[PDB]
Write a protein that binds this ligand. Structure first.
Ligand SMILES: OC[C@H]1O[C@@H](O)[C@H](O)[C@@H](O)[C@@H]1O
Ligand SMILES: [Ca+2]
Ligand code: NA
Length: 307
């Protein structure tokens, strides 16, 4: 006996979604009647759309979709609803209007703003404890920021709220550079290397990255330029970032809870595949069809909890 569930990951080479992918597959092992059909959309929404057509033709009873493009949620909804197939969107949040457009569309993710606020609180905490970080002694944080994908809710909120949080805590900032590296380590290394080769190089006091993968690239570029005392902040708490916090090569990150997002996505998909209320028999709190899993700030104080 078997219930098929189709799953997409927007790109398997995304560091964070690779963690989520493995956690989904691990959780599915405990429900041997489920057969997961797991797909790498390779960062291409048209490929994902074709994959969804195949999954529906192969008789999946639910879809768990990590969109390539958040704006494509209506296309996916239109495909799934033809035969009343439920969708748990996850990690890339569709619009409220898209979620409300189909009774069987749900979302599992995070409060994106919370991660920006926590990151700003972490930067404030360390800035206030490290007066030497104010290289030009002007009382302002001269920073560069590595942004995630334009329009991605986590990139937009982390970028807006890290700065609002710092400023509201009484720490003025000066944005020397702000550009996207598309969540990617190599793009971030190249972008940081360019900034370190230009006129703002010696003015940079803090590196803020919307994720750990981009922070890791910035760390490499800082090392190449012998700027290892410029602090770097990320988001996700990837193992590699936790190792950099331990060595002092990153100042802080924020746990993006892949384990519980994967478990909630799988649990909701499994209930919906059976025609049951989405959170039945689970602890997940659905609020207007959305589950949000808390972020947690991580630095040297609480690092031992995570390694
Ligand atoms: O959608 C993918 C993105 O999701 C974000 O929540 C993670 O912080 C990023 O690392 C990841 O690249
Ligand atoms: Ca300064
Ligand atoms: Na994992």
């Amino acid at each position: 006996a078997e219930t098929r569930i189709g799953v997409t990951i927007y790109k398997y080479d995304d560091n964070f979604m690779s963690v989520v992918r493995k956690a989904i597959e691990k959780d599915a092992k405990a429900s041997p009647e489920i057969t997961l059909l797991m797909n790498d959309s390779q960062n291409d929404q048209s490929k994902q759309n074709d994959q969804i057509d195949v999954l529906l033709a192969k008789g999946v009873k639910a879809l768990a979709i990590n969109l390539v493009d958040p704006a494509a949620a209506p296309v996916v909804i239109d495909k799934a609803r033809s035969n009343d197939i439920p969708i748990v969107f996850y990690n890339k949040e569709p619009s409220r209007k898209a979620l409300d457009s189909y009774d069987k569309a749900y979302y599992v993710g995070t409060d994106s703003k919370e991660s920006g606020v926590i990151q700003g609180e972490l930067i404030a905490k360390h800035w206030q404890a490290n007066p030497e970080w104010d290289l030009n002694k002007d009382g302002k944080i001269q920073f560069v920021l590595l942004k995630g994908e334009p329009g991605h809710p986590d990139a937009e909120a982390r970028t807006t709220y890290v700065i609002k949080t710092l400023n509201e805590k009484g720490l003025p900032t000066q944005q020397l550079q702000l550009d996207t590296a598309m969540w990617d380590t190599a793009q971030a290394k190249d972008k940081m290397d360019a900034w370190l080769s230009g006129p703002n190089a010696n003015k940079i006091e803090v590196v803020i990255a919307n994720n750990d993968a981009m922070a890791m690239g910035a760390v490499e570029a800082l090392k190449a330029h012998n700027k290892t005392s410029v602090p770097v902040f990320g988001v996700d708490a990837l193992p590699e970032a936790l190792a950099l916090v331990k060595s002092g090569q990153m100042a802080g990150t924020v746990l993006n809870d892949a384990n519980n997002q994967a478990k909630a996505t799988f649990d909701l998909a499994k209930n919906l595949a059976a025609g049951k209320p989405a959170a039945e028999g689970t602890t997940w709190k659905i609020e207007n069809k959305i589950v949000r899993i808390p972020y947690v700030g991580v630095d040297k104080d609480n690092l031992a909890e995570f390694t």
